[PDB]
Amino acid sequence: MLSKRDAILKAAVEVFGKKGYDRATTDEIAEKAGVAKGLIFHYFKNKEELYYQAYMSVTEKLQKEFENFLMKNRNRDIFDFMERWIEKKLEYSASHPEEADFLITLVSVDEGLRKRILLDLEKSQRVFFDFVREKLKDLDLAEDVTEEIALKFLMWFFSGFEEVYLRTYQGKPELLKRDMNTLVEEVKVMLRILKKGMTK
Amino acid sequence: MLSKRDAILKAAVEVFGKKGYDRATTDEIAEKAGVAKGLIFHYFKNKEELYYQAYMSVTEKLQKEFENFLMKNRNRDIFDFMERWIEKKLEYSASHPEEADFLITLVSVDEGLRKRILLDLEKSQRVFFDFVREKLKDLDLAEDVTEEIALKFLMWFFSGFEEVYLRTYQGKPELLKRDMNTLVEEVKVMLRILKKGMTK
């Protein structure tokens, strides 16, 4: 069976993703996890720490999948790189819907909690950011488009698309699987649009 | 002085925008508005109705500003149209920060409340949507870009940019005013990027 801490973290992902941070209570996470309530306090102190730890836990496993992807695909054109990784993220969300539902809740938590998580994730997200930045120096940019506007626009596209499908398909993995081909084709054309508009 | 219902609505915009929907209580809105609590019940029934009415109230005044803008700018190129309207939205957010802070809270409310508001706003948002759709028939699109992918991408850009700056500048109007010129220049280049990538 799961360790206690892992049982609580799984229950937390499920409850938080189902109800959002403010509505969820630790008592129902403990009940979901079938664990003594004071065990949540033992391991996590309070609800805010539980959420943050659950959040770091899910992102940590994704960061690792990203790190291998980056190693193997490091030489690709950056738009092909992005498209391929978006496909993998879409694949993962469909097979891990509870985790995907949980991740999108980061917009509900107070200012302070979301900023803490963003401060503590900055170092890991900057790994993808710094790779895009270096890859853009190889790009034959339009005479009116700076590497800065390119980086800004590409990251917004990337992060914004993820936000859109996670929110749109929230709690509906079968719908995501059903639209997967179409989303993928749409993402291909949009990245080609951006490449063509940004380059000579 | 304000009518009672208007006093409650103003207090609601301020409290909801400061604390988010779940955290806010009607008692503190009434206290903020300096009105009897049962007056909130008289006019609004419960917290969910108050939020929805406040939301319809702020969007109604924006929809009207949009309708005049559309009338006067109807003949413009759609990318110039979008850029000009984005400038006006940025101007408005900076001079109505409490309203801007309130509008971005729509991501925290339960699924049911946000969908109700989205169902009831569909008819008014579709006014801008249907104009873009007709304007795209005049566009000399790339041989690989459908009017459907164009419409999808332009609306996402438009709605996504608004979401980004509202969230980024939340509670910081002086920062928005300070970055306004740069944001505007960035938006110009990004729309030119999209136009160039979408067209022949």
Question: How buried is B75 (Cβ within 10 angstroms: 0-12 exposed, 13-18 middle, 19+ buried)?
Answer: exposed
Task: Determine the topology of domain B47-200 in CATH.
Answer: Tetracycline Repressor; domain 2 (1.10.357)
Is the minimum CB–CB distance between B164 and chain A shorter than 8 Å? Answer: yes
Is the minimum CB–CB distance between B198 and chain A shorter than 8 Å? Answer: yes
Query: Distance between CA atoms of B157 and B187, rounded to whole angstroms?
Result: 10
Q: Provide the experimental method for this PDB entry.
A: X-ray
Contacts 24+ apart (CB under 8 A), A127-135: A127/A63, A127/A66, A127/A67, A127/A70, A128/A66, A128/A70, A129/A155, A131/A70, A131/A74, A132/A78, A135/A78, A135/A81
Radius of gyration in angstroms for the set of CA atoms belonging to chain B, rounded to a whole number: 19
Unique residue bearing structure tokens 């957010």: B93
Buried residues in B42-69 as b, exposed as e (16+ CB within 10 A): eebeebeebbbbbbebbbeebbeebeeb
Residues 61-100 of A with CB under 8 A from B: none
CB distance B132 to B76 below 8 Å: no
Q: Quote the tokens at residue A132.
A: 């895009």
Resolution (A): 2.0
Q: How far is A2 from chain B (nearest CA, A)?
A: 31
Query: Distance between CA atoms of A112 and A118, rounded to whole angstroms?
Result: 10
The residue ranges of every structural domain in chain B are 2-46, 47-200
Q: Quote the tokens at residue B39.
A: 């007056």
Beta-bridged to residue A199, according to DSSP, are A141
- Please identify, in words, the CATH class of the domain defined by A2-46: mainly alpha
Task: State the DSSP code for B141.
Answer: B
CB contact under 8 Å between A164 and B156, yes or no, is yes
Angle between helices A37-44 and A4-19 (to 10 degrees): 100
CB contact under 8 Å between B108 and A193, yes or no, is no
* From B22, B186, B194, residue closest to A149, measured CB to CB: B186
Selection from A82, A159, A144 nearest residue B168 by Cα: A159
Phi, psi of B96 (to 5 degrees): -130, 60
Q: Which residues contact B80 (CB under 8 A, 6 or more apart)?
A: none
Buried residues in A18-37 as b, exposed as e (16+ CB within 10 A): bbbbbebebeebbebbebee
Q: Quote the tokens at residue A159.
A: 């992060």
Query: Distance between CA atoms of A28 and A41, rounded to whole angstroms?
Result: 13
Q: Which residues contact A87 (CB under 8 A, 6 or more apart)?
A: A184, A187
Contacts 24+ apart (CB under 8 A), B43-51: B43/B4, B43/B5, B43/B8, B44/B8, B47/B21, B48/B113, B50/B8, B50/B12, B50/B26, B51/B12, B51/B16, B51/B21, B51/B109, B51/B113
Query: Distance between CA atoms of B85 and B69, rounded to whole angstroms?
Result: 8
Separation in Å, CA B88 to CA A10, B20, B143, B173: 45, 25, 33, 15
Locate the chain B residue with the closest alpha carbon to A22. B22
Task: State the DSSP code for A39.
Answer: H
Residues A175, A176, A181, A184: what is their CA dihedral angle, to the nearest 10 degrees?
150
CB distance B107 to B55 below 8 Å: no
Q: Which amino acid is at B99?
A: E
Sign (positive/negative) of CA torsion B172, B178, B179, B180?
Answer: positive
Task: Give SS3 for B199.
Answer: strand
Separation in Å, CA A76 to CA A84, A118, A131: 10, 28, 11
Which secondary structure element, helix H or strand E, spans residue A140, and what is its range? none
Per-residue HEC secondary structure of B64-131 comes to HHHHHHHHHHCCCCHHHHHHHHHHHHHHHHHHCHHHHHHHHHHCCCCHHHHHHHHHHHHHHHHHHHHH
Q: How far is B2 from chain A (nearest CA, A)?
A: 31
Task: Give SS3 for A37.
Answer: helix
Is the minimum CB–CB distance between A184 and chain B shorter than 8 Å? Answer: no
Query: Distance between CA atoms of A197 and B193, rounded to whole angstroms?
Result: 4
Task: Give SS3 for A104.
Answer: helix
Residues 13-72 of A with CB under 8 A from B: 20, 22-23
Beta-bridged to residue A141, according to DSSP, are A199
CB distance A140 to A188 below 8 Å: no
